[PDB]
Every structure is written in C-alpha cells, then in structure tokens.
C-alpha cells in the first residue's frame, strides 16, 4: 500500500489549506514518525469554529473525529493544550479558513 508519516500529512495539509486561501499553520510538532495530530478549523467568515482529533478503529483504520462537542472558542483552544499533557508527542494544525474548511485528505466526522 503506502507508508505516510505524521510530518507528511502536516506538510501536505498546510499546503492545500493555504491553497484554498486559509491562514493555516502548524502549532505543535510531535514525532515525525509516531506522533498524533489535532486539526482545529476556525470559520472567521461566519464567526464559528470546530476542532477535530484523529481516532482509530479495531483495525487501526483511521478517521478525524471531534471529541469536543462545544463550539465555544476557549473550549476548543484548550483541547489543543489538554491533549499534549497525556499524548506522547502530538502535532497541532490550525486552519483559519473562510467557510470552516479543513482541506484534510481523509474521512471526517461530525
């Protein structure tokens, strides 16, 4: 199949997000092989936001879930501190888009 890495997705993701016309950036740099990833998505057009985390299935089959069922700005931004106090080396990617876009190559939940 293929063999991506943590750095690879955060590279690709930033490039595509900026391409759409977001102020995307990486805000934490976990392990380049074996690090987890967060993706926050802030809609400055409407004045809304959301926040996504990776998750995996029984098979290690991966998705982007949203483990913070709030839309309040501090509740969200606090997650992207919180996680890193228990996750071993976790990345943070921030997508200040227009239309709350995420530019992720992968399945994402609601």
UniProtKB/TrEMBL annotation:
Gene3D superfamilies: Protein of unknown function (DUF1491). It comes from the Bacteria. Pfam families: DUF1491 (PF07372). This is DUF1491 domain-containing protein. It comes from Caulobacter vibrioides (strain ATCC 19089 / CIP 103742 / CB 15). The lineage of its organism: Bacteria, Pseudomonadati, Pseudomonadota, Alphaproteobacteria, Caulobacterales.
């Amino acid at each position: 199949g293929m063999l991506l890495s943590t750095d690879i997705w955060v590279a690709a993701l930033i490039r595509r997000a900026e391409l759409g016309g977001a102020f995307a950036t990486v805000a934490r740099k976990g392990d380049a092989r074996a690090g987890a990833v967060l993706v926050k998505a802030v809609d400055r057009r409407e004045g809304t936001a959301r926040l996504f985390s990776e998750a995996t299935r029984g098979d290690g089959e991966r998705f982007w879930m949203q483990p913070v069922r709030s839309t309040f700005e501090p509740d969200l931004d606090a997650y992207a501190e919180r996680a890193a106090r228990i996750d071993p080396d976790i990345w943070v990617v921030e997508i200040e888009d227009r239309d709350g876009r995420h530019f992720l190559t992968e399945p994402v939940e609601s």
